[PDB]
Each structure stands twice: as structure tokens, then as C-alpha cells.
């Protein structure tokens, strides 16, 4: 499936996607996307829309 990440770094906001076989794999890829851009913080996941958020 396609998973989405909404990144909120404050002034900087990102929206990306990844194809993954499951949510756990998408999550790991999204975790590395977030920290590559200096965003470490609070995570949420909505399985109904396959949408993660990470907020500084």
C-alpha cells in the first residue's frame, strides 16, 4: 500500500509517501526521513488512512 507522512518541524513542514508491505516498514523509513531533516518528536499513526504524523 501507499503510506503518507506529515512532518511538522515548526516553520518547516513536509508531506512524503513511501510504498511498503506493511505499516511497520513504512514507519522505519519515515523515521529516518524525519531525523535526516532534524525532526525528532511526537509520532502518530492512523491505520484508516495509512497516515503517520511526526511533530517536533
Numbering used by the authors: 1 to 56
Give the text the authors published on this PDB structure.
Through subsequent X-ray crystallography and computational analysis of synthetic GB1 proteins with amino acid substitutions at the i + 2 residue of the β-turn, we show that amino acid side-chain identity and its rotameric conformation have a direct influence on the strength of an n → π* interaction.
With the decreasing helix propensity of amino acids in the order Ala > Ser > Val, we noted an increase in both d and θ between COi+1 → COi+2, suggesting a gradual weakening of the n → π* interaction at the i + 2 residue. Thus, to obtain a quantitative estimate of the n → π* interaction energy (En→π*) at the i + 2 residue in 2, 3, and 4, we resorted to NBO analysis, which clearly indicated a decreasing En→π* in the order 2 > 3 > 4.
